Amino acid sequence: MNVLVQGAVHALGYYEDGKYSREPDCYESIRDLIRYLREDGDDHTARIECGRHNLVEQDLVPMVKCEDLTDDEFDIAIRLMVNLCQPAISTMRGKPPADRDQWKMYWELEENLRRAKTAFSDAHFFTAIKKRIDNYFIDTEYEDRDERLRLVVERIVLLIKYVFSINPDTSEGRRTRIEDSSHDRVIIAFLESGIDKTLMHIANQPREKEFHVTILDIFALILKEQTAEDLATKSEEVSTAEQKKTEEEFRKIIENHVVKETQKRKSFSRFGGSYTIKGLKGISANSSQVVFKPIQNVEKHNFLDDRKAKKRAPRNRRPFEIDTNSHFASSEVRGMLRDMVIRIIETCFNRLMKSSKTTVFVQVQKTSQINYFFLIKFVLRFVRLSRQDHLLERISECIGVEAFHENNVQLTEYVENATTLKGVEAKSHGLKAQYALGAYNELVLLHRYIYEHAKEENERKFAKRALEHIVNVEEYRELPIFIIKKFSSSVLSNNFLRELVLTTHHYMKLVERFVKTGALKKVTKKVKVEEIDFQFDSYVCKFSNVDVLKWYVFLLNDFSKNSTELNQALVKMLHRIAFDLKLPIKLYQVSLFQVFSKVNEHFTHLSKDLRKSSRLYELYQFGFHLLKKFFSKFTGDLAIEALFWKGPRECFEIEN
Amino acid sequence: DDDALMYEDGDSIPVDILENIRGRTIRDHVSDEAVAKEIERRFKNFLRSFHEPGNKQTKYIQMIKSMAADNRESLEVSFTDLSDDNGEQNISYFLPEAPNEMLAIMDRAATEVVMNMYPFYSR
Amino acid sequence: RLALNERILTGPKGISALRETLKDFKPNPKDDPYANLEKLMKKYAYWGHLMFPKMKTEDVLNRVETLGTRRQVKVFMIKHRL
DNA sequence: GTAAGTGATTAGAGAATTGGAGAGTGTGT
DNA sequence: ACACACTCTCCAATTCTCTAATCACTTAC
């Protein structure tokens, strides 16, 4: 077999520095390569040999840059390039590698794709394909178009999608989090060619519907590595301020190093001995405790817990993150992307979303659902944070009550499939559920922003009716407890749980305001449907269940690296049960006292002024008040009751 | 379907293979079978046909004759003759970069040239 | 095999031994709550070290918090609260 | 509206599947 | 002889299903 591939591959041409030189029978060589790839088996021998020889970087992209290239040569080059740039799981027909030997072939396919990405860091390639796109759409009328050029244009568009869906590469080196990614260089070349304006022009046309889903996928994959907070703030700098700032940063680093080293070298002591702690019992009979280092005081003793190996969970039940390569890019890249986002909102968004929502959930392919929810979340957060209030007309496809309805339906289906299935399939459905939850959170926050800051009372009334519908109907009010009771770390990421906590925080603030203004007094409930009085304390009491409070104590362990918003949300939810329902017995628990011990140890290293200046002072103060309330009436049986989670009758009998 | 997009029913002086290799890491590509056969053909042609400039004699055929007269089994080739315009400059390029792979092919070619002029040399 | 379980948690090394350890502990309510917490936490560690020496204090308290859901431990607590 | 009966939900126990630790034994220096 | 690696066996955790008891809703006076 592969002698045929080796004969075809080296017969194309050779790249001089700055010029590719071609042999006359490139056309027949490329035909033979396509023929072999069509006839390749499950071993994928011809495909792996093409990946070994690096056809895309060495030959095909420099060939496409040539000016003398005729129509058929360009056409068949694009055909072969699309087939080689197909993703790996698509080559493996959707099945993930279930076996030790299948994973080897998957990895061998994946590395060849990761190597090829730096070929597309040149604007000349995008300039070359932009002319063919312009010929079909702009320079040819709808009556006079050719199906051959139609298929070529479809291949070019799918090639752009396949290029932007390539993963990052670790082998080239490790790069810091505060500089331009390798993805950004492809973005710079893509935007400098100006092909994005043609893509926006195509997306604006109602007649050209079949390209719209792919164009949505392309713009989502461009914005893959960014967050709305990076682009929302307008970029400006002065180098005087930058120099002063960097000098202060290294001043912090130097002082930290000197203090830490002097503390460590002052810790050591010279000689030894061995000592008995009279009053503490040993394991063996009639024995006192014995130590073999000069301890300062008896409370410094640790019972040699440093030796003992920690118990691990089994491999099916450990928490897992999902990693997006996320960085603070340069001011140049951020300015270009900000301009692109504003142009998309002005020219494409309403038509594109309206064309997409009829089709995205009907299709066989899974990934466009994730792209749909991602683009919704990004655009709405960008509008709200940038305060570009005149753009609110342009996103009117997403403001209705129907948006909340359709989002809730899709989120419910994803949660049920992710809970009931097993394995990588369950993780795959849970990944969809995560993006749906984030889009729901942005819907809530955007409607509150419109109701607070819009200038037109008609727009305020339209937002207010939607907010009242969300507060009133049971499906929206029962959703957080429904998801929290089904959470499991085997099939859902930590990012999902953080997102769920923040969503619950914002929703409960909305319900509290609509009760406080008196707008919520009576509530419909299913039986037939009947109306009953609503009480906010009765609603808050649902979250005091043990199956909810487990995860709040679980996420409070990461306090030293959480964001300030997440720390505020966790402390606020505990503070409500502590001092609004006024029920501290449910929070008296050893696994929370461990978190308080860690926080106290962290705060020992700071002076009395720096403690009040610190960002963790809210958590410190809450721990102070709860521990004082605990020790106000300490008893030994209460200290025994702290070891177990306490139910309702347990709380009543402990209290009374 | 992507198969229907990518495949079609139409899929149902000769080229110098060696000159397109000039920039690669040659160790990885002289193991390609189509390259080894081409090098093996051209080195036999070089041994049979090379003329020293200003001379009418096939130098390496004369050297093989004087080697066979003494029953020796190694043949000395000049890198200058390999790298001149009448030699094979692709072989002279490839040789210092992958000598373990290249010398084996040249040994095989030299053996096949000797065994036709002198069939008794297997003894 | 060997593992911490309900027999050990209800046995003579268990909850009754922890109660006997805690009989001498009497914190001052007017003092620093974090200091009182530190004093309590190391008595928990001392009881855990005597009760099951193989494992860390953190994992011992996690295992006790897990084993509180068993019916045998619940029946023990129902008798013990009297 | 109140009391009694019946239905539904929740709690416990038994059985089966999955995974990981520990100890024993064999081989190589 | 001593160290290191590999294989086998057992036990514990989880989830489903069936049975029994307690609580709440419906019906009748």
Query: Do B and C touch (≥3 CB pairs < 8 Å)?
Result: no
C70 closest-nt by C1' vs CA: D12
A563 by DSSP, 3-state: which? coil
**CA B123: distance to chain centroid?**
26
Stated length of chain B: 123
Rounded to whole angstroms, the Cα distance separating A11 from B20 reads 7
C2 closest-nt by C1' vs CA: E11
Closest by CA to A404, choosing from A468, A497, A457, is: A468
Residue A290: phi and psi, rounded to 5, are: -130, 135
User: CB B6 to CB A6 under 8 A?
Assistant: no
φ/ψ region of C49 (left if φ > 0, alpha if ψ in -120 to 50, else beta) reads: alpha
Rounded to whole angstroms, the Cα distance separating A549 from A577 reads 10
Q: State the best of A608, A611, A622, A628 to mutate against chain C, taking most chain C CBs within 10 Å.
A: A628
Closest partner residue to A597 among C25, C41, C55, by Cβ? C41
Q: How many CA atoms lie within 13 A of A373 on its CB side?
A: 23
Indicate which technique resolved this structure: cryo-EM
Rounded to whole angstroms, the Cα distance separating A213 from A352 reads 8
Mind telling me how many Å the CA of C65 is from chain A's nearest CA? 5
Q: For every residue of C9-28, which 3-state class applies, written as one string?
A: HHCCCCHHHHHHHHCCCCCC
DSSP assigned state of A633: T
Tokens 């090639």 correspond to A159
Residues 6 or more apart whose Cβ sits within 8 Å of residue A652: none
Rg of chain A taking only CA atoms, in angstroms: 31
A277 by DSSP, 3-state: which? strand
Structure tokens given for A83: 């087939």
Q: State the best of A10, A53, A365 to mutate against chain B, taking most chain B CBs within 10 Å.
A: A10
Residues 6 or more apart whose Cβ sits within 8 Å of residue B66: none
Chain B contact partners (≥3 CB pairs within 8 A): A
Calculate the angstrom distance between C1' of E9 and CA of C4.
21
Buried/exposed code over A237-258 (b: 16+ C-beta within 10 A; e: otherwise): eeeeeeeeeeeeeeeeeeeeee
Question: What torsion, rounded to 10 degrees, do the Cα atoms A502, A506, A509, A511 define?
Answer: -120
B85 touches chain A (CB under 8 A): no
Q: State the best of B15, B39, B94 to mutate against chain A, taking most chain A CBs within 10 Å.
A: B15
Cβ atoms of residues A581 and A540 within 8 Å: yes
CA quadruple A352, A358, A361, A365: dihedral sign: negative
User: CB C22 to CB A636 under 8 A?
Assistant: yes
Rounded to whole angstroms, the Cα distance separating A238 from A63 reads 44
Cβ atoms of residues A622 and A574 within 8 Å: yes
Distances (CA, A) of A428 to A140, A366, A367: 43, 10, 10
φ/ψ region of A94 (left if φ > 0, alpha if ψ in -120 to 50, else beta) reads: left
User: CB C61 to CB A600 under 8 A?
Assistant: no
Question: What torsion, rounded to 10 degrees, do the Cα atoms A43, A46, A52, A56 define?
Answer: -130
Question: What torsion, rounded to 10 degrees, do the Cα atoms C60, C65, C68, C70 define?
Answer: -80
Report the chain A residue with the minimal C-alpha distance to residue C48.
A303
Mind telling me how many Å the CA of A115 is from chain C's nearest CA? 45
φ/ψ region of A83 (left if φ > 0, alpha if ψ in -120 to 50, else beta) reads: alpha
Structure tokens given for A244: 């002063």
Cβ neighbourhood burial of C44 (10 Å; 0-12, 13-18, 19+)? buried
CA quadruple A589, A595, A597, A600: dihedral sign: negative
Closest partner residue to B33 among A3, A155, A158, by Cβ? A3
Structure tokens given for C67: 């084993």
Residues 6 or more apart whose Cβ sits within 8 Å of residue A192: A123
Cβ atoms of residues A454 and A392 within 8 Å: yes
Question: What torsion, rounded to 10 degrees, do the Cα atoms A161, A165, A171, A175 define?
Answer: 100
Cβ atoms of residues A608 and A593 within 8 Å: no
B23: chain A residues, CB-CB within 8 Å? 14-15
Report the chain A residue with the minimal C-alpha distance to residue C68.
A644
Mind telling me how many Å the CA of B92 is from chain A's nearest CA? 19
Nearest CA to the C1' of D22 belongs to which residue?
A: C1
Residue type, A179: E
Cβ neighbourhood burial of B81 (10 Å; 0-12, 13-18, 19+)? middle
Cβ neighbourhood burial of B47 (10 Å; 0-12, 13-18, 19+)? buried
C63 closest-nt by C1' vs CA: E13
Q: What is the DSSP string of C18-82?
A: HHHHHTT----TTS-HHHHHHHHHHHHHHHHHHH-TTS-HHHHHHHHHHHTTSHHHHHHHHHHT-
Mind telling me how many Å the CA of A161 is from chain B's nearest CA? 13
Rounded to whole angstroms, the Cα distance separating C47 from C24 reads 14
Residue A586: phi and psi, rounded to 5, are: -70, -25
C55: chain A residues, CB-CB within 8 Å? 308, 311
B5: chain A residues, CB-CB within 8 Å? 82, 151, 154-155, 158
C5 closest-nt by C1' vs CA: E12
Buried/exposed code over A535-553 (b: 16+ C-beta within 10 A; e: otherwise): eeeebbeebbbeebbebbb
Rounded to whole angstroms, the Cα distance separating A158 from A218 reads 9
List the nucleotides on chain E closer than 7 A to a protein CB. 10-13
User: CB B35 to CB A11 under 8 A?
Assistant: no
A631: chain C residues, CB-CB within 8 Å? 27, 29, 33, 36-37
Report the chain A residue with the minimal C-alpha distance to residue C25.
A636
Closest partner residue to C40 among A281, A283, A639, by Cβ? A639
Residues in a beta bridge with A21: A14
Q: How many CA atoms lie within 13 A of A571 on its CB side?
A: 23
φ/ψ region of B118 (left if φ > 0, alpha if ψ in -120 to 50, else beta) reads: beta
Residues 6 or more apart whose Cβ sits within 8 Å of residue A39: A46
Specify the resolution in Å.
3.8
Calculate the angstrom distance between C1' of E3 and CA of A479.
59
Rounded to whole angstroms, the Cα distance separating A449 from A438 reads 17
Residue type, B23: G
Tokens 């749906």 correspond to A436
Distances (CA, A) of A354 to A151, A432, A459, A462: 25, 21, 21, 20
Cβ atoms of residues C78 and A654 within 8 Å: no
Q: What is the DSSP string of A278-317?
A: EEEE-SSTT-EEEESS--SSGGG--TTTTTSPPP---GGG
List the nucleotides on chain D closer than 7 A to a protein CB. 11-13, 18-22
Neighbouring C-beta atoms of residue A588, cutoff 10 Å: 19
Residues 2-21 of B with CB under 8 A from A: 2, 5-7, 11-12, 15, 17, 19-21
Neighbouring C-beta atoms of residue A556, cutoff 10 Å: 22
Tokens 């080296």 correspond to A10
**CA A177: distance to chain centroid?**
16
A450 by DSSP, 3-state: which? helix
A305 touches chain C (CB under 8 A): yes
C54: chain A residues, CB-CB within 8 Å? 308
Cβ atoms of residues A623 and C37 within 8 Å: no
Buried/exposed code over A7-24 (b: 16+ C-beta within 10 A; e: otherwise): bbbbbbbbbeeeebebee
Closest by CA to A407, choosing from A446, A366, A441, is: A441
